Amino acid sequence: DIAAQHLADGIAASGPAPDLAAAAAFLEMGDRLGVVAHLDPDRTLETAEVAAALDLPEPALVRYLDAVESAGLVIREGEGRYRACPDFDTIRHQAGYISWTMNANRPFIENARDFFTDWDKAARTHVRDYREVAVSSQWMGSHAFYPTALATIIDAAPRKVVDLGAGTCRLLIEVLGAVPGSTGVGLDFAADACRAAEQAVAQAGMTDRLTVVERTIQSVATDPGVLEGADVIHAGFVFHDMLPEEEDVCDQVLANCRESLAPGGFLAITDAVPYLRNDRERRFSAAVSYYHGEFMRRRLQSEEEWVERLRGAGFSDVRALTLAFPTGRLFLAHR
Amino acid sequence: DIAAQHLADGIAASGPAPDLAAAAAFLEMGDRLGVVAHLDPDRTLETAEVAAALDLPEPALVRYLDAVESAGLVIREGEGRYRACPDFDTIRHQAGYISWTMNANRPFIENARDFFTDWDKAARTHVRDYREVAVSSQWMGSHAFYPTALATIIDAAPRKVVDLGAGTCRLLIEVLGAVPGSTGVGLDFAADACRAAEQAVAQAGMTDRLTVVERTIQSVATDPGVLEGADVIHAGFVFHDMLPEEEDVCDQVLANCRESLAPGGFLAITDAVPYLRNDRERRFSAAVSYYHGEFMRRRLQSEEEWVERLRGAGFSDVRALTLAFPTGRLFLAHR
Numbered sequence A, B: 001d002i003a004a005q006h007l008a009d010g011i012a013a014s015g016p017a018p019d020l021a022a023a024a025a026f027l028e029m030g031d032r033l034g035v036v037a038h039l040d041p042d043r044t045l046e047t048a049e050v051a052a053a054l055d056l057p058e059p060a061l062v063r064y065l066d067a068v069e070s071a072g073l074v075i076r077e078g079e080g081r082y083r084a085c086p087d088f089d090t091i092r093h094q095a096g097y098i099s100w101t102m103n104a105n106r107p108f109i110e111n112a113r114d115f116f117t118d119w120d121k122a123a124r125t126h127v128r129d130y131r132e133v134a135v136s137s138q139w140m141g142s143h144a145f146y147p148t149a150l151a152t153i154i155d156a157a158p159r160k161v162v163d164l165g166a167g168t169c170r171l172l173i174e175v176l177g178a179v180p181g182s183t184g185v186g187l188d189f190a191a192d193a194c195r196a197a198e199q200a201v202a203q204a205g206m207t208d209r210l211t212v213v214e215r216t217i218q219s220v221a222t223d224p225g226v227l228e229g230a231d232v233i234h235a236g237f238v239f240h241d242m243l244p245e246e247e248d249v250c251d252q253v254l255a256n257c258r259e260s261l262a263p264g265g266f267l268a269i270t271d272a273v274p275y276l277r278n279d280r281e282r283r284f285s286a287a288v289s290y291y292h293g294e295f296m297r298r299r300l301q302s303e304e305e306w307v308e309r310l311r312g313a314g315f316s317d318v319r320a321l322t323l324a325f326p327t328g329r330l331f332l333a334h335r
């Protein structure tokens, strides 16, 4: 009788945490192996072929997939064939938040004492794995920021679209595929990301429309030529890296963005605003804010600071839109 | 208009994951610092004193507490005084699951490929931090298994209580404080845990009632004398470590437990059963099962295997109770 009461009380106390904890660990483990990229609710993963492609022993891969099937994350369709559960993309999205705070930002969790005593020594010793930062933020973005930026670029029907920090040019290839007769300039300093975006642009069929330029966003303050005539300039979570050290460079990048825009054009920036108080956003906002401010020393600006800076760059009007990503804001700065 | 739809859709997609991700990272970070032990909803943490006790710079501790206050996990009562939010213990409990899968079992997430190719080399290279295993399971236990075992021992009104794997003797001190005129034998091989339990037993006032014995549970198969006359013998998640290597030793420990019990006595074992299919437990059950079976090679037994083994040890009747901890079962084996 007492065991039944403790059972109902404990289920209410645990809530959704055991499911989320299990999903995040299985998905991070599978992503590091390269397995999660082959999991999709509309098609099967064939173990014989995937084990060869990923260079894993097939028995070990089958035991991983059988544990993930027992968890309810995949369905065994036939022998050696597994399909993701129908709500897989939502589970992967939620796992993104746990991976970001517990995996991508792990050096900060484990070595906080070092950061509090000698920040400069700690900042160069305990560094984040950039592949984990990239995958976890892509998972968070899938349902919480990427579709708002995507629908905003597309519905403006642009002739030219520029992406500052384009990465693998996924947003640029999707906007070009939906807007008939549009060109795009993908800007990213990484040679590894640019070479991957170059091959992805060719297979999509837009090698003449999409120009990949291996350059830093800070180089746009000196050379804004590639921005000229753009209808939409996109910048997703790339400006706070410059603040507060490269403040004047960042201000020049924004001023160049405004002058370069074609009539009716806009600069669409998505960024994180610091320490919100509202109940829905406050907890994740505080984690994003503390990791940026305390551990990375990157300046996050409020909506008011952002609007003032964007008006100081010549922009006539600035609109702020709340994103589902807690503490995330989309600023549309009209020329 | 499109931003409003993406906003509602994204909030529904993210659900409770941003809050849980943020709470787990703040609580793991604060626990490693030694701060979380001073956070309680009924009293304040005084920063001037806590920074000195933990040997942390006070400004850094204040900035951590101000971020945790912004998150809603603490309330600033006065200057330099912070109190945990009223539902702090529930949030800490839920964080326990995330800490267990993402922190305590991190070597398995990051090095799964090594385990799949050379298990023996991987098992000795990528080892779990035992302090993280202990704290995360204590947090999960607080609302999901500890109270059921506690209420079961107490309501049986025992004269003598034995705890195999007593740790810091917290359960034994709580049962002794509620059952008037009861003695307890705390058994734990760790010298660091035994020395901490020895001082905690003295401050509680039960130094004559509670005997701390620094011994292994496997030594009970050869020397069962300390078990004789016990009304309740408790064993929380300690038997699967022996399986499947020390099978015969484990069987002798259980057979000795049965003979040693005083009339009407019982052995209360809590353990994890493998790969459950029911919707509520399947996901966390699969994570517990895969970490134990694949990475640790520790045998988890089903309810049927456990009942058969307990009857093979002489026990007349065995009852299985579902615990709120998913895949957790409490077996009461009556003499």
Ligand SMILES: CC(C)CC(=O)C(=O)O
Pocket: A104, A133, A137, A140, A237, A272, A288
């Ligand atoms: C999506 C962002 C929160 C990613 C970021 O700014 C970071 O991980 O540093």
Ligand SMILES: CC(C)CC(=O)C(=O)O
Pocket: B104, B133, B137, B140, B237, B272, B288
């Ligand atoms: C509470 C248990 C799941 C802990 C355990 O068995 C482990 O972490 O290995």
Ligand SMILES: [Cl-]
Pocket: none
């Ligand atoms: Cl003008």
Ligand SMILES: [Cl-]
Pocket: none
């Ligand atoms: Cl008998």
Ligand SMILES: [Zn+2]
Pocket: A237, A240, A241, A292, A298
């Ligand atoms: Zn950042």
Ligand SMILES: [Zn+2]
Pocket: B237, B240, B241, B292, B298
């Ligand atoms: Zn275990």
